[PDB]
Design a protein around this ligand. Structure first.
Ligand SMILES: OCC[C@@H](O)c1cccc(OCC2CCCCC2)c1
Ligand SMILES: OCC[C@@H](O)c1cccc(OCC2CCCCC2)c1
Ligand SMILES: OCC[C@H](O)c1cccc(OCC2CCCCC2)c1
Ligand SMILES: OCC[C@H](O)c1cccc(OCC2CCCCC2)c1
Ligand SMILES: [Fe+2]
Ligand SMILES: [Fe+2]
Ligand code: NA
Ligand code: NA
Lengths: 510, 510
């Protein structure tokens, strides 16, 4: 949890327009950047929160800005460029908001504003949002290369900003299909050097709980053998979604609604045999954005999640007008929101009918349960790993390359305090111990883990976070490096310009 | 949680018949019995687990034994006597099992085997089980005085072993009525000196979810202004209950069943105005035996519970044949049981329809939620205070006389390890910090709190527990005194005879 209030309102700098750079800046280092740290921290966020006098309204509307911190021989540079999406290019051409964004209707066509994340496919990098459009970008120069429409390759209406990436480069993702949720597989780059996106295919399909209302999906779980999909009560109303938006004046937010009675349905598919498994896992209602990690343990799936307790859409609390209020009002506004909580669910793969009415979770190290009912629903209860009052452990990251899909011990996260990011956190998922890093008037980003290249342990490395520090008598922002063992500071690299909120990203080793 | 295994099987001594004493024994003190500790620890449990060659089968069937430890000027005595109930007297007369017990059908009439608890009414003390019969006992000599049939005074079929006792001596209890659940109030002793039981009355009534199947009820919550009743999915099948038992060969356990779909319904009544409040609080399924404490906070009720996650009746795992198995088998048998977990529920008293779809728990220091649905059900999620794998914090006690019904910080409990009692625990309900006391091959009882006479703080006092220590090179049992601050040992008082399991009790100051 946080130990800090924010009466000075500095968090408003997260949502203020910035200018791009024409070339990199030096970042001024205090302490010692590790000499084994070589590569680029690439991150995406909104950078332009209005077009002239026309405002963007929602957190997820501002124009995509691609950021890069470079690390070589103890030195750091910072660079950023707006992504030349259709949304951005047409906005600059016509000097107004042209494309409708998540929560901003454009007055007189799907957004490709790739403000959320960036990931590798073959030898390429793509910036993304959650639509059918992804944007190929140059990871060295930050130039925009092209727009890719996933509909030219596979049958989905969109795909999440959180694909899984296996160690050979295979990319898995999930998307709505308008009715199913489809898993897309993009193969690794082959000898022919053809674009792996042209070899995309749907490998498995998950059913939908309601023919006319698919659930919003933000991420999904993956292990060597299984795919996990969590179907929440946050629904997309297709009657509103598919009607003419410029007639009714609609955006994406306007089409969301909450199903009050379904709770959460959890789904598993066999990855290698490409089959849906018809086990009816059921639990109480929550919003889910981020899976933390998923793994197999004696034929139970361990499903660690960042939950929000409630069925109201958490995104209702993320309009910029609310995030820009003063601190007492920010706290007030969050009082009735769903409460964040880290939860471990445990899904049995072997269901014996003879155990009807009993708890199937016979593993020795968990309090999670799964009750087989007579109608064959399997009712689940979680093991809570972390819970604090409006204190969210969010934007989770792990040592992904060596523990993604596997038994693991450690997660890193951004701590939110009534939605305001104000600390960095580490959680031991076995013991429930936590570690916190926090300074007054300092607004960090998602922490990304970088292993020492020769590490044998799980947390032998560092985390990197971009911190906005608007207090006078500090530079406006800095790159923070913490030791992953205990979250103690190793170095920081200060820049002379503001940096807005960033969502997700990656470290690219060179 | 426990840090101890039990391969030697010493816990079997908890379920072995003992003899009563004709007068008190000296208990041999090591350490220092506090000099302010003056009075009697009175506890009940089973003491006779067979009649000749006819065995009792369930944990709750053995014949009531009343135990007393007396404390004066640093010295301790121990005494025990079988309660001369009908069940026990008729068993000794006819040399067989005569009355059907909870899980033992007598072959060729309600049990009054008062093996569970003891409590004060006026100037009297009554041993009890959960039926219509309570047994008046002499707290100094342990002689049995009288059988009292509550049906002579009030309309209930039974009453729990956990009445609440206000500081003036007013007694509240709850019981099934064959359909409602009735709250009984027994007034304090008046100037006329008449038996307060003859002034008993029903003051409020809770409705039942199912006309033909009332829930099992073990305890309930009380505050200065409210009464809280938790209606669980463990049901009593009245078609089986009210049929002829000697025809079918039935006991009480045979009439229980689990309702799979209802979950848990929570209920509130206004204590002083004597009215049921029609708020439909709803959550997922659990067993509940013991409320920890309940209190009011800005017109939310804070409801702290010892839960078991699941709908299967936890009492299925408590047959003596299973509790007497070897340790690996004990662990195996508990794998599919509901998982224990301490949970805080928060119940809003002011429900605004304008907040439909939102979380009503606007208190600043909890993660518990209550979602108002369109059908006006209020769906609850808990804040988990403690959770360990088959590690139950059970038999909760607090500083009851000063903090019962009131804002509080500390609870004490008996720790169960796959149902075997092997440690004592303290929980800070605000911070979730825990303290444990535990020795190898030592089986404690419920801890009971006794305040220091000059206490300033909530935990200024001791806890008393009866510990069974069957390892050779130790005496068979002892009275343990722990400092309530940190659960460090202050003294023990050893006795030269075995003591079986005890359930509940009280400290009587003199
Ligand atoms: O994928 C982007 C993250 C978004 O899903 C999400 C999920 C859960 C909480 C949340 O909070 C938004 C805050 C982030 C930091 C800036 C202030 C608002 C945002
Ligand atoms: O009111 C009497 C206690 C009974 O309700 C109960 C409630 C919850 C767990 C439990 O476990 C039984 C073990 C207690 C210690 C002896 C061994 C069995 C027993
Ligand atoms: O996670 C934050 C919102 C996301 O960036 C976003 C921004 C703009 C449009 C979106 O649309 C989601 C739909 C796309 C089509 C298929 C159904 C989901 C989603
Ligand atoms: O907590 C252990 C079981 C309890 O002592 C017990 C022992 C014997 C008979 C019982 O009967 C419960 C019913 C009484 C009549 C009304 C419905 C409950 C209950
Ligand atoms: Fe995300
Ligand atoms: Fe009890
Ligand atoms: Na600090
Ligand atoms: Na110990």
């Amino acid at each position: 949890s946080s130990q800090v209030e924010h009466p000075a309102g500095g968090y408003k700098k997260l949502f203020e327009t910035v200018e791009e750079l024409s070339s990199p800046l030096t970042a001024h280092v205090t302490g010692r950047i590790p000499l084994w740290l070589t590569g680029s921290l690439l991150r995406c966020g909104p950078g332009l929160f209005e077009v002239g006098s026309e405002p963007f309204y929602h957190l997820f509307d501002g124009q995509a800005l691609l950021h890069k911190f470079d690390f070589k021989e103890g030195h750091v540079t910072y660079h950023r460029r707006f992504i030349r999406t259709d949304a951005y290019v047409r906005a600059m051409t016509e000097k107004r908001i042209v494309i409708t964004e998540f929560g901003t209707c454009a007055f007189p066509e799907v957004t490709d504003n790739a403000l959320v994340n960036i990931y590798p496919v073959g030898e390429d990098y793509y910036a993304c949002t959650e639509t059918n459009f992804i944007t190929k970008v140059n990871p060295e120069t930050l130039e925009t290369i092209k727009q890719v429409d996933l509909c030219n390759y596979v049958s989905v209406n969109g795909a999440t900003a959180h694909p899984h990436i296996e160690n050979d480069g295979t990319v898995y993702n999930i998307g709505n299909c308008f009715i199913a949720y489809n898993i897309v597989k993009i193969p690794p780059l082959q000898a022919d050097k053809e674009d792996p996106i042209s070899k995309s295919e749907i490998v498995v399909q998950f059913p939908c709980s309601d023919r006319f209302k698919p659930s919003y999906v933000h991420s999904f779980g993956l292990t060597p053998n299984y795919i996990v999909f969590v179907e929440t009560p946050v629904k997309i109303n297709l009657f509103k979604f598919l009607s003419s938006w410029s007639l009714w004046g609609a955006n994406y937010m306007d089409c969301f609604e909450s199903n009050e009675t379904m709770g959460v349905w959890l789904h598993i598919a066999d990855k290698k045999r490409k089959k849906y498994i018809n086990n009816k896992y059921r639990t109480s209602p929550f919003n889910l954005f981020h899976h933390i990690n998923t793994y197999e343990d004696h034929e139970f799936l361990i499903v660690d999640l960042c939950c929000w307790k409630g069925f109201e859409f958490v995104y209702n609390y993320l309009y910029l007008a609310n995030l820009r209020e003063n601190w007492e009002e920010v706290k007030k506004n969050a009082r009735k929101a769903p409460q964040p909580e880290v939860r471990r669910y445990v899904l049995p793969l072997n269901i014996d009918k003879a155990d009807t009415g009993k708890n199937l979770v016979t593993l020795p190290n968990t309090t999670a349960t799964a009750i087989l009912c007579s109608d064959e629903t399997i009712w689940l209860e979680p093991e809570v790993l972390f819970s604090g009052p409006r204190q969210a452990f969010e934007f989770p990251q792990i040592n992904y390359q060596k523990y993604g899909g596997k038994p693991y011990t450690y997660a890193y996260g951004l701590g939110l305090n009534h939605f305001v990011p104000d600390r960095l956190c580490k959680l031991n998922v076995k013991t429930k111990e936590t570690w916190v890093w926090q300074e007054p008037d300092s607004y960090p980003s998602e922490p990304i883990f970088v292993s020492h290249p020769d590490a044998l342990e799980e947390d032998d490395g560092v985390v990197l976070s971009v911190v906005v520090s608007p207090g006078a008598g500090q530079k406006p922002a800095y790159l923070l490096i913490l030791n992953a063992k205990d979250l103690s500071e190793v170095a920081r690299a200060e820049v002379e310009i503001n940096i807005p909120v960033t969502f997700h990203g990656l470290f690219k080793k060179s």
